[PDB]
Design a protein around this ligand. Sequence first.
Ligand SMILES: C/C(=C\COP(=O)(O)OP(=O)(O)O)CS
Ligand code: SF4
Length: 309
Amino acid sequence: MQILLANPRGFCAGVDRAISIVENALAIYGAPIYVRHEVVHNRYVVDSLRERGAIFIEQISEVPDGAILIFSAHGVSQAVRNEAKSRDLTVFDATCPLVTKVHMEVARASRRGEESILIGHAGHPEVEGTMGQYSNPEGGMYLVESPDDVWKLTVKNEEKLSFMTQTTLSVDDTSDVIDALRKRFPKIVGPRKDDICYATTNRQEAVRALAEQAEVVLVVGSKNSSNSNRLAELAQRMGKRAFLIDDAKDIQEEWVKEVKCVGVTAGASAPDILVQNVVARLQQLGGGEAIPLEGREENIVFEVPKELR
Ligand SMILES: C/C(=C\COP(=O)(O)OP(=O)(O)O)CS
Ligand code: SF4
């Protein structure tokens, strides 16, 4: 069994920054450190930070007066931010800059009372954070997940309409949604393509190359990781058996039993150690040396705020 590794895979710049933010805050202020939502959607990262004194919460009200609070990388609504500000809290913001950039455009359209459309998945914290940057009731903010959603949407003023997207979507599916938006709303404005980040684009492209070669694809990522799900989904649509797994323990022998070629990748929130352990498990099942595929070299880094060193 050949073991192939997708390139790129694993940590993006946003995730690495956000984790370091919580780690550094723990190191300088000691435990506990309050974090609104899982800092990134990875069970190993979160349980580790929790064992080190991070307390993960959904709402500001469960955070005590005087505490240190950190927003997760997925971002937060304006309502959340102001509730946090209104309280006696010391606030660090770990939202990825690439999320913030989308937020600022939404805020712009709000100030103008001009309607905006967000392509995203309902209930996802990044969508709630992004939708929550709009508040001017003279306009509006609408969520669409699919072309069918577009085909049902009515707006107040189609001549002044803009769109934004979640950063972790399927590149292919989002192209279909945007196509629909422009056919229905010919005057709609947006970025040149979408707001899907380099990391999401790159990892989907890399899983594409991976599954052209491999018969089975293992995607390291937690169940609530949207971008990780997109990788598994992508490979499955190409007709490959593909599994989303947290660690090597999740691997069932039947999945690879008589497979000559298995591919492995990881979502943007999964640490490399999980992949090495997955590989280690595959080698117990007759896998050889892991061969990393050639891939686009990522070079972007987001520094922690100076205050956090
Ligand atoms: C911080 C973000 C993605 C990193 O991965 P994640 O699994 O933590 O988050 P989603 O993929 O958005 O679920 C959303 S911008
Ligand atoms: S996925 Fe893209 S947007 Fe989300 S954190 Fe990583 S880099 Fe930032």
